[PDB]
Amino acid sequence: IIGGEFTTIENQPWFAAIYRRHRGGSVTYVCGGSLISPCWVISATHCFIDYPKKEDYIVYLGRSRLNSNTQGEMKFEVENLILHKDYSADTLAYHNDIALLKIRSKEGRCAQPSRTIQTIALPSMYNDPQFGTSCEITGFGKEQSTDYLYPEQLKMTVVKLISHRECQQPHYYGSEVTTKMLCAADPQWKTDSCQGDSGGPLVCSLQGRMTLTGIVSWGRGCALKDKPGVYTRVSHFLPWIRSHT
Numbered sequence: 001i002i003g004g005e006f007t008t009i010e011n012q013p014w015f016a017a018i019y020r021r022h023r024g025g026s027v028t029y030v031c032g033g034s035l036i037s038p039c040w041v042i043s044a045t046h047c048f049i050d051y052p053k054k055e056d057y058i059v060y061l062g063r064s065r066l067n068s069n070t071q072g073e074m075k076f077e078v079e080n081l082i083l084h085k086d087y088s089a090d091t092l093a094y095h096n097d098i099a100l101l102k103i104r105s106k107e108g109r110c111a112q113p114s115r116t117i118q119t120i121a122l123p124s125m126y127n128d129p130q131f132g133t134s135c136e137i138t139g140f141g142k143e144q145s146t147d148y149l150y151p152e153q154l155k156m157t158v159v160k161l162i163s164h165r166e167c168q169q170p171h172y173y174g175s176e177v178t179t180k181m182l183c184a185a186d187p188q189w190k191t192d193s194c195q196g197d198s199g200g201p202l203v204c205s206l207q208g209r210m211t212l213t214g215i216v217s218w219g220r221g222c223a224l225k226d227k228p229g230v231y232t233r234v235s236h237f238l239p240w241i242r243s244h245t
């Protein structure tokens, strides 16, 4: 996350931290996700597509820091890794950038809700807020495009939903952005999602409740002028989400 503020997991208790075991022993951060039910984390396919073996991944819930344990955190194996059959990668855009991780502990239990571990609501079908709506993004992603390290502490910022029509202007993304994508940006382009934030939540207050509107997918740099964040439009994927859960 470029700009925004540091936060703790209590402010985004659905936030999942997804890591991969390396042949050797070492564990590296992959991507964020969102607890949508006790046993199910939703994320981005492009996070896993290079290493699509479920046994390689670890999910934490209730985790506020990258490389230290948070009091109350739960650690999970991936019992199922579901990648979107119709996934594709362009030079810039991911299509159908959506994935489901069925989580279970060594002792065979799903997530136990707590102050630091809550589920987020999916939206009603084809129902997103208007352009100009303020939504929150959360991630352990880079603080600057050029940074080598990810931040130790979880971050979150505010971005405004951009109209499909504004996001398809050639000097933005042209036709790279489809009806299954959402754009969000800061009016000053000063705050944004970035590398490491992929798969993490775009959350909007919708029908007066916190709703998983987007999944961090792609963008051309981070906090660049005329280069908004591009998000999987979760309201266009409910059948796929219902069916695979």
Ligand SMILES: COc1ncc(-c2nc(C(=O)NC(=N)N)c(N)nc2N2CCCCCC2)c(OC)n1
Pocket: 142, 144, 145, 146, 192, 193, 194, 195, 196, 197, 198, 216, 217, 218, 219, 220, 221, 222, 223, 224, 227, 228, 229, 230
């Ligand atoms: C031109 O440089 C460039 N371009 C793209 C990325 C990148 N961006 C995002 C992202 O969400 N961007 C955004 N919201 N504006 C994102 N979610 N992920 C990004 N990478 C991770 C996976 C995609 C390609 C490599 C960079 C990047 O990160 C340092 N740097």
